Amino acid sequence: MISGSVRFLVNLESLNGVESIGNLTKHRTAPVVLKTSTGYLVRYVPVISGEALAHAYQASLVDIAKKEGLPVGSLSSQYEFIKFSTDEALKIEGIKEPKDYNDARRFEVEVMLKDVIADVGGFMYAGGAPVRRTSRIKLGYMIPALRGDEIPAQLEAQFHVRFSNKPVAIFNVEVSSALYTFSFELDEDLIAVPSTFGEKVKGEEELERQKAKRVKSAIKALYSLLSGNFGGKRSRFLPSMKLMSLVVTKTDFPFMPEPAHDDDYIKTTIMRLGKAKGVLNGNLAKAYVINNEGIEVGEGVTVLSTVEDLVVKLEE
Amino acid sequence: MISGSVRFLVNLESLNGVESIGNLTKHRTAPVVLKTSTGYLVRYVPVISGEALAHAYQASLVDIAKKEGLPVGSLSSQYEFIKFSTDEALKIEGIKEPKDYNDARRFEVEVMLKDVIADVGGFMYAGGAPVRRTSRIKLGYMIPALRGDEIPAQLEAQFHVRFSNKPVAIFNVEVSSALYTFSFELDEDLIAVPSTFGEKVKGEEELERQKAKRVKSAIKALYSLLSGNFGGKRSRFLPSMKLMSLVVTKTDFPFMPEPAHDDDYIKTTIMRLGKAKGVLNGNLAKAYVINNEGIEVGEGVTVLSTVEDLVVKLEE
Amino acid sequence: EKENIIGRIANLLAVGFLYSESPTLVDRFANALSKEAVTKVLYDVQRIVQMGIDRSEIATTTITDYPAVNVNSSGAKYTVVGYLPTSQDIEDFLRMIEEDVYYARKAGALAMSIANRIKLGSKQSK
Amino acid sequence: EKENIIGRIANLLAVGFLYSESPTLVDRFANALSKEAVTKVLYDVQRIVQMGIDRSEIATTTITDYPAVNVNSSGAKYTVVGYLPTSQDIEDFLRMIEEDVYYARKAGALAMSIANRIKLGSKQSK
Amino acid sequence: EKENIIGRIANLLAVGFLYSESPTLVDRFANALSKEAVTKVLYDVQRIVQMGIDRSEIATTTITDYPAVNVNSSGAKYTVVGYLPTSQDIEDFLRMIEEDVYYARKAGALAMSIANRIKLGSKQSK
Amino acid sequence: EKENIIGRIANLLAVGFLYSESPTLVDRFANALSKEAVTKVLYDVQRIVQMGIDRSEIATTTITDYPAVNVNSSGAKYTVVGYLPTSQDIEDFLRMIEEDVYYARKAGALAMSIANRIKLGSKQSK
RNA sequence: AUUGAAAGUUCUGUUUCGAAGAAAACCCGCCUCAGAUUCAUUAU
């Protein structure tokens, strides 16, 4: 597994939107419970949904797969990830619906040999014989660090007008600035492996042949998420992003690094990784740390400089 | 026995679901009675069922048992814990149904030598000669702390859309944030011990041989529950969890630690443990405390740092 | 007077729902478990009503005489019978919510009943 | 007038049951021991009816003339004879519930009787 | 006395809104999550009111006698009933905000209610 | 004692504003983002007050007894109630600004409140 | 002080055992607050 925690600093930002009231475009906000010296409090803070991150990751994976010759679905060739949920998608792609439960595996393989997106991000088919496949990449909401007693985030509204020589043209846009943090998980040991239980079906040999390329493409696709290519309204509200801290852990056993809420979350996660490897009878545990804010790290830890080096090391 | 009380802080959470209305997915809510300076009040607060925790614990136990070579049932090999309730499960596994009451013990042993899950989590068979086995692990609902006059919990709805180039795709998801608390109990002195009264039956020697390994696996399985690997909708709504306080008590006599509702629930439970050992004529009483919020603890108490150390100490 | 306040809050929620064509604010109001959620909806619905007032799509009127509010939305015309809440009604209602959030559910149930009856009558005439 | 209110609430519950194909809201209503449970069902059933109105699958009509509600669900057509409750009927019914939760059981028993008779007639014609 | 302070702050926000014809300061006040945002609005609204005072477009008066503030904006005449906050009210209100930013939402909700009622009455008379 | 220092500061800014008939120094003080801007205003306002003292147009007094400052400007007479800051108050206030520039905004908001109330009362009289 | 007067139908019992509402999804595509203004005439 590959589990990562990342901290970003973004200023003058609007990438996620919600329903609009009047001539005002609103930014997504969520409640958070924060601990202060006086107890516990509830606050409302701007956030960014994880679905945008998933869409960006899937689009980058589509581009990489098309460049490298891996098969891509007809509907997924266009950036519309309906996958194989409805019958119209099946009719367009040309895959017969499953007949009974025993045929479900076959259907899964037929879906899995045509689109890498269905293999990596999972899919669902609802009907007489429903078929499920959980996504192999897991993300979450982007929340600013809940450090100290003051939340380092702010939101405001801005005024804009449209010019016209014959007045008969005024709108408002919400803009936020914060220090965001988010974590991600990706299990590469189950890529190109069927999930529905059953008997062997012809076509698994091709999946075994393409497993290495699929894993390499899935690992490469994380560069877009780690770089900052996500969100909307980038034509006129391009944000200013800067990486501050990054922790990546590669293990053969389940593990979850500490959230990037406290200033000391690298030493703790390294110690927890060591103890978890000791207690769970593991055989592989590696850590990579990128630091640009001069906080405590620890000892015996590999230190990188950019994200491309991390991607190359993960691929190798 | 091993009895524990744990406090967690979770933000932007949706792991448990209930019936949906329209295009809205709802979060489980329950009534709670809370005491304020003006008397007693009734409130509606989001909660998480204990069945999800039991499923996560049983899945982790299945994984550990398969890794360590302990036997695992055919149906339980797949993550479907129907156990041996219906006749179809018995036919699939290949175990004859009990004939009369006197044969029931034999049937229990046959169930107990094939699946560790049936041994630890108990099972039920309904028929002419019903067979019962109570679970050896006891959990409860996850309720936020009812401290003070204000409940530190919040619930809201979020708006989501699905993109399509040919409109003909809108849903809502409930998201909560709270400071959860829960307690658990596990009696390891009855693992790998038959419960139905009767005469000796061949096959108990193997159970006696495997008792130590079964107890070790059962103790190890608590790491997933204590770490935060439970609940659903983790693909796009991965929560942010952080341990705050943990108390674990190991005794040779029945005991129940105080619920994590008041700020001072460690000193009280330690004093109660000492007095209970004094009054009940016990011979073993140990306590372990993990504290990260700087609350009162007491004197003469072992203080740990992570959860892996606690698991190792419990195993040793 | 508590029932009159609840009825005027229900009229405000029904006007906001009919004008916005969205149940989201009424859903939030009827599911509220805190004063924060109730107060946020009371602002957001009044902000929607303020836009309708500025556009002259929401206006007070009398109908045979009973006080009413005319609402024009997407070429549909609706008429809600009754008064909108005063600032004092909002303040007294927030005090009722600080004692018991039940009153938000009562106002939400009334608001949805007003909106449903008006929508049914408008569809039948079409 | 109390019986007329109870009958109109029973018609609402029967329409919601026939449209949703779920007895769960009627079960909750007939087993209610508090005003909270009753009020929650009154919202949830009206929210289901609101979706049927917006989809034009629930409509008011007259049948030989008696007032009725047509319900289309899963290709089945049902007709409930009578009026749906007004906002005033919901408010007066909630006041009756605050005095005695028995009236929720009475409305639930009537609603299940309406739904059962309609389902039996629809299965016989098929 | 806390409610009187909140009411006087709401009158200041309503006068500033009616004079500027802009909801932007009231929106900022009701959405404030910090003392910084609240204090910035309290300055900016008083700066708008100061310009109206210097132009003699904002004046204190009595109306049948209740204290009031007359506001002239774009040829419209408005009258807000009540007092404007004192320096002590601003200071005590900022102390209330340092304890709980909820009071900014309460004042914003009251201010918008005052402004909406006055705008509705002015449009009806026209 | 911090609030007393901030209040005396307000009073100095309000006296300087009423005497100069210019809000420019109070605007600069309330918008300050550095100790440089705050210190520059503290000098410039005291330099204006020094001219008013030398002209006998600014004088300390007592009013029914509370300490006050009489200000004569352009034939208008104003009275600010309170003390002017001491040299120690300026030094302690600059130390507060070196920790948090928020205190300049607090003093500016108080100063504008004092000046507005005095200007309103003076316009009403007559 | 009456068809009244005088009396326990009282004792012993668990509705208990088990099961994830789970999987898939972008509020994103276009807009400028813009044009006009002397702090100068008197002071060893």
Coordinates of N, CA and C in Angstrom, one line a residue, chain A residues 72-192:
Chain A
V72 N -8.8 2.2 -23.5 CA -9.6 3.2 -22.9 C -11.0 3.0 -23.4
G73 N -12.0 3.1 -22.6 CA -13.4 3.0 -23.0 C -13.9 4.1 -23.9
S74 N -14.9 3.8 -24.7 CA -15.4 4.8 -25.6 C -16.0 6.0 -24.9
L75 N -16.9 5.8 -23.9 CA -17.4 6.9 -23.2 C -16.4 7.5 -22.3
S76 N -15.5 6.7 -21.7 CA -14.4 7.3 -20.9 C -13.3 8.0 -21.7
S77 N -13.3 7.8 -23.0 CA -12.4 8.5 -23.9 C -12.7 10.0 -23.8
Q78 N -14.0 10.4 -23.9 CA -14.4 11.7 -23.5 C -14.4 11.8 -22.0
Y79 N -14.1 13.0 -21.4 CA -14.0 13.1 -20.0 C -15.4 13.2 -19.4
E80 N -16.1 12.0 -19.4 CA -17.4 11.8 -18.8 C -17.4 10.4 -18.2
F81 N -17.2 10.4 -16.9 CA -17.0 9.1 -16.1 C -18.3 8.5 -15.6
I82 N -19.2 8.3 -16.6 CA -20.4 7.5 -16.2 C -20.1 6.1 -16.0
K83 N -19.0 5.6 -16.6 CA -18.6 4.2 -16.5 C -19.7 3.3 -17.1
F84 N -20.0 2.2 -16.4 CA -21.0 1.2 -16.9 C -22.2 1.1 -16.0
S85 N -22.7 2.2 -15.5 CA -23.8 2.2 -14.5 C -25.1 1.9 -15.2
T86 N -25.5 2.6 -16.3 CA -26.7 2.5 -16.9 C -26.7 1.6 -18.1
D87 N -27.8 1.3 -18.7 CA -27.9 0.4 -19.8 C -27.5 1.1 -21.1
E88 N -27.7 2.4 -21.1 CA -27.2 3.2 -22.3 C -25.7 3.1 -22.5
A89 N -25.0 3.2 -21.4 CA -23.5 3.0 -21.5 C -23.1 1.7 -22.1
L90 N -23.8 0.6 -21.6 CA -23.5 -0.7 -22.1 C -23.9 -0.9 -23.5
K91 N -25.0 -0.3 -24.0 CA -25.3 -0.3 -25.4 C -24.3 0.4 -26.2
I92 N -23.9 1.6 -25.8 CA -22.9 2.3 -26.5 C -21.6 1.6 -26.6
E93 N -21.1 1.0 -25.5 CA -19.8 0.3 -25.5 C -20.0 -1.0 -26.3
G94 N -21.1 -1.7 -26.1 CA -21.3 -3.0 -26.7 C -21.0 -4.2 -25.9
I95 N -21.4 -4.2 -24.6 CA -21.2 -5.3 -23.7 C -22.5 -5.8 -23.2
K96 N -22.7 -7.2 -23.4 CA -24.0 -7.8 -23.0 C -24.1 -7.8 -21.4
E97 N -25.4 -7.5 -21.0 CA -25.6 -7.5 -19.5 C -25.5 -8.9 -19.0
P98 N -25.1 -9.1 -17.7 CA -25.0 -10.4 -17.1 C -26.4 -11.1 -17.0
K99 N -26.3 -12.4 -17.2 CA -27.6 -13.2 -17.2 C -28.0 -13.6 -15.7
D100 N -27.1 -14.3 -15.0 CA -27.3 -14.7 -13.7 C -26.1 -14.4 -12.8
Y101 N -26.1 -14.9 -11.6 CA -24.9 -14.6 -10.7 C -23.7 -15.3 -11.2
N102 N -23.8 -16.5 -11.7 CA -22.6 -17.2 -12.1 C -21.9 -16.6 -13.3
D103 N -22.6 -15.8 -14.1 CA -22.0 -15.1 -15.2 C -21.3 -13.7 -14.8
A104 N -21.6 -13.3 -13.6 CA -21.1 -11.9 -13.2 C -19.6 -11.7 -13.4
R105 N -18.8 -12.7 -13.0 CA -17.4 -12.6 -13.2 C -17.0 -12.4 -14.6
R106 N -17.6 -13.1 -15.5 CA -17.4 -12.9 -17.0 C -17.6 -11.4 -17.3
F107 N -18.8 -10.9 -16.9 CA -19.1 -9.5 -17.2 C -18.0 -8.6 -16.7
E108 N -17.6 -8.8 -15.4 CA -16.5 -8.0 -14.8 C -15.3 -8.0 -15.7
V109 N -14.9 -9.2 -16.1 CA -13.7 -9.3 -17.0 C -13.9 -8.5 -18.2
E110 N -15.1 -8.6 -18.8 CA -15.3 -7.9 -20.1 C -15.2 -6.4 -19.8
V111 N -15.7 -5.9 -18.7 CA -15.5 -4.5 -18.4 C -14.1 -4.1 -18.1
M112 N -13.3 -5.1 -17.5 CA -12.0 -4.8 -17.0 C -10.9 -4.9 -18.1
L113 N -11.2 -5.5 -19.3 CA -10.3 -5.6 -20.4 C -10.5 -4.4 -21.4
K114 N -11.4 -3.5 -21.2 CA -11.7 -2.4 -22.1 C -11.4 -1.1 -21.6
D115 N -11.5 -0.8 -20.3 CA -11.3 0.5 -19.7 C -10.4 0.3 -18.4
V116 N -9.3 1.0 -18.4 CA -8.5 1.0 -17.2 C -9.1 1.7 -16.0
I117 N -10.0 2.7 -16.4 CA -10.6 3.5 -15.4 C -11.6 2.7 -14.5
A118 N -12.3 1.8 -15.2 CA -13.2 0.9 -14.4 C -12.4 0.0 -13.5
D119 N -11.2 -0.4 -14.0 CA -10.4 -1.3 -13.2 C -9.8 -0.6 -11.9
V120 N -9.4 0.6 -12.1 CA -8.7 1.3 -11.0 C -9.7 2.0 -10.1
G121 N -10.6 2.8 -10.6 CA -11.6 3.5 -9.8 C -12.8 2.8 -9.5
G122 N -13.0 1.5 -9.9 CA -14.1 0.7 -9.5 C -15.3 1.1 -10.4
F123 N -16.4 0.4 -10.2 CA -17.6 0.6 -10.9 C -18.8 -0.1 -10.3
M124 N -20.0 0.2 -10.8 CA -21.2 -0.4 -10.3 C -22.2 -0.6 -11.4
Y125 N -22.8 -1.8 -11.4 CA -23.9 -2.1 -12.3 C -25.1 -2.6 -11.5
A126 N -26.3 -2.0 -11.6 CA -27.5 -2.3 -10.9 C -28.5 -3.0 -11.8
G127 N -29.0 -4.1 -11.3 CA -30.0 -4.9 -12.1 C -30.3 -6.2 -11.5
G128 N -30.7 -7.2 -12.3 CA -31.0 -8.5 -11.8 C -29.8 -9.1 -11.1
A129 N -28.6 -8.9 -11.6 CA -27.4 -9.4 -11.1 C -26.4 -8.3 -10.9
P130 N -26.5 -7.5 -9.8 CA -25.7 -6.4 -9.5 C -24.2 -6.8 -9.4
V131 N -23.3 -5.9 -9.9 CA -21.9 -6.1 -9.9 C -21.3 -4.9 -9.3
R132 N -20.3 -5.1 -8.3 CA -19.7 -4.0 -7.6 C -18.2 -4.2 -7.7
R133 N -17.5 -3.1 -7.7 CA -16.0 -3.0 -7.7 C -15.6 -1.8 -7.0
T134 N -15.0 -1.9 -5.8 CA -14.6 -0.8 -5.0 C -13.4 -0.1 -5.6
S135 N -13.3 1.2 -5.5 CA -12.2 1.9 -6.1 C -10.9 1.6 -5.3
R136 N -9.8 1.5 -6.1 CA -8.5 1.2 -5.6 C -7.7 2.5 -5.1
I137 N -8.3 3.6 -5.3 CA -7.7 4.9 -4.8 C -8.7 5.6 -3.9
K138 N -8.3 6.0 -2.7 CA -9.2 6.5 -1.7 C -8.7 7.9 -1.3
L139 N -9.6 8.9 -1.4 CA -9.3 10.3 -1.1 C -10.3 10.8 -0.1
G140 N -10.2 12.0 0.4 CA -11.1 12.6 1.3 C -11.2 14.1 1.1
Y141 N -12.0 14.8 1.9 CA -12.2 16.2 1.8 C -10.9 16.9 2.2
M142 N -10.7 18.1 1.6 CA -9.5 18.9 1.8 C -9.9 20.0 2.9
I143 N -9.3 19.8 4.1 CA -9.6 20.6 5.3 C -8.4 21.3 5.7
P144 N -8.5 22.6 6.1 CA -7.3 23.3 6.6 C -7.0 22.8 8.0
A145 N -5.7 23.0 8.3 CA -5.2 22.4 9.6 C -5.9 23.1 10.8
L146 N -6.3 22.2 11.7 CA -7.0 22.7 12.9 C -6.0 22.8 14.1
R147 N -5.0 23.7 13.9 CA -3.9 23.8 14.8 C -4.1 25.1 15.6
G148 N -3.8 25.0 16.9 CA -3.9 26.1 17.8 C -5.4 26.5 18.1
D149 N -5.6 27.7 18.4 CA -6.9 28.2 18.7 C -7.5 29.1 17.6
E150 N -6.7 29.5 16.6 CA -7.2 30.2 15.5 C -7.0 29.4 14.2
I151 N -8.1 29.3 13.4 CA -8.1 28.6 12.1 C -7.4 29.5 11.1
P152 N -6.4 29.0 10.4 CA -5.7 29.8 9.4 C -6.5 29.8 8.0
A153 N -7.7 30.4 8.0 CA -8.5 30.4 6.8 C -9.3 31.6 6.8
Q154 N -9.7 32.1 5.6 CA -10.5 33.3 5.5 C -11.3 33.2 4.2
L155 N -12.5 33.8 4.2 CA -13.4 33.8 3.0 C -14.0 35.2 2.9
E156 N -14.2 35.6 1.7 CA -14.8 36.9 1.4 C -15.4 36.9 0.1
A157 N -16.1 38.0 -0.3 CA -16.8 38.2 -1.5 C -16.2 39.3 -2.3
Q158 N -16.2 39.2 -3.6 CA -15.6 40.2 -4.5 C -16.6 40.6 -5.6
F159 N -16.5 41.8 -6.0 CA -17.5 42.5 -6.8 C -17.0 42.6 -8.3
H160 N -17.8 42.3 -9.2 CA -17.4 42.3 -10.6 C -18.6 42.8 -11.5
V161 N -18.2 43.5 -12.6 CA -19.2 44.2 -13.5 C -18.8 43.8 -14.9
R162 N -19.8 43.8 -15.8 CA -19.7 43.5 -17.2 C -19.9 44.8 -18.0
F163 N -19.0 45.2 -18.8 CA -19.1 46.5 -19.6 C -20.1 46.3 -20.7
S164 N -20.9 47.4 -20.9 CA -21.8 47.5 -22.0 C -22.1 49.0 -22.4
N165 N -22.2 49.3 -23.7 CA -22.4 50.6 -24.1 C -23.9 51.1 -24.0
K166 N -24.8 50.1 -23.8 CA -26.2 50.4 -23.8 C -26.8 49.7 -22.5
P167 N -26.6 50.4 -21.3 CA -27.1 49.7 -20.1 C -28.6 49.6 -20.2
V168 N -29.1 48.5 -19.6 CA -30.5 48.2 -19.6 C -30.9 47.7 -18.2
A169 N -25.6 42.7 -15.2 CA -24.2 43.0 -15.6 C -23.3 43.2 -14.4
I170 N -23.8 42.7 -13.2 CA -23.1 42.8 -11.9 C -23.2 41.5 -11.3
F171 N -22.1 40.9 -10.8 CA -22.1 39.7 -10.0 C -21.0 39.7 -8.9
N172 N -21.1 38.7 -8.1 CA -20.2 38.6 -6.9 C -19.6 37.2 -6.9
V173 N -18.4 37.1 -6.5 CA -17.6 35.8 -6.5 C -17.0 35.6 -5.2
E174 N -17.1 34.4 -4.6 CA -16.5 34.1 -3.3 C -15.1 33.7 -3.5
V175 N -14.2 34.2 -2.7 CA -12.7 33.9 -2.7 C -12.2 33.6 -1.3
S176 N -11.4 32.5 -1.2 CA -11.0 32.0 0.0 C -9.4 31.9 0.0
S177 N -8.8 31.9 1.2 CA -7.4 31.7 1.4 C -7.2 30.9 2.6
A178 N -6.4 29.8 2.5 CA -6.2 28.9 3.6 C -4.9 28.1 3.4
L179 N -4.7 27.3 4.5 CA -3.6 26.3 4.5 C -4.2 24.9 4.6
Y180 N -4.4 24.3 3.4 CA -5.1 23.0 3.3 C -4.2 21.8 3.6
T181 N -4.9 20.7 4.1 CA -4.2 19.5 4.3 C -5.1 18.3 3.8
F182 N -4.5 17.3 3.3 CA -5.3 16.1 2.9 C -4.4 14.9 2.8
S183 N -5.1 13.7 2.9 CA -4.4 12.4 2.9 C -5.0 11.5 1.8
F184 N -4.3 10.6 1.3 CA -4.7 9.7 0.3 C -4.1 8.3 0.5
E185 N -4.8 7.3 -0.1 CA -4.4 5.9 0.1 C -4.6 5.2 -1.3
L186 N -3.6 4.3 -1.6 CA -3.7 3.6 -2.9 C -3.0 2.2 -2.7
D187 N -3.8 1.2 -2.9 CA -3.3 -0.2 -2.8 C -3.1 -0.7 -4.2
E188 N -1.8 -0.9 -4.5 CA -1.4 -1.3 -5.9 C -1.3 -2.8 -6.0
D189 N -1.5 -3.6 -4.9 CA -1.4 -5.0 -4.9 C -2.7 -5.7 -5.5
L190 N -3.8 -4.9 -5.6 CA -5.0 -5.4 -6.2 C -5.4 -4.9 -7.5
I191 N -4.5 -4.1 -8.2 CA -4.7 -3.6 -9.5 C -4.6 -4.8 -10.5
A192 N -5.6 -4.8 -11.5 CA -5.6 -5.8 -12.5 C -5.9 -7.2 -11.9

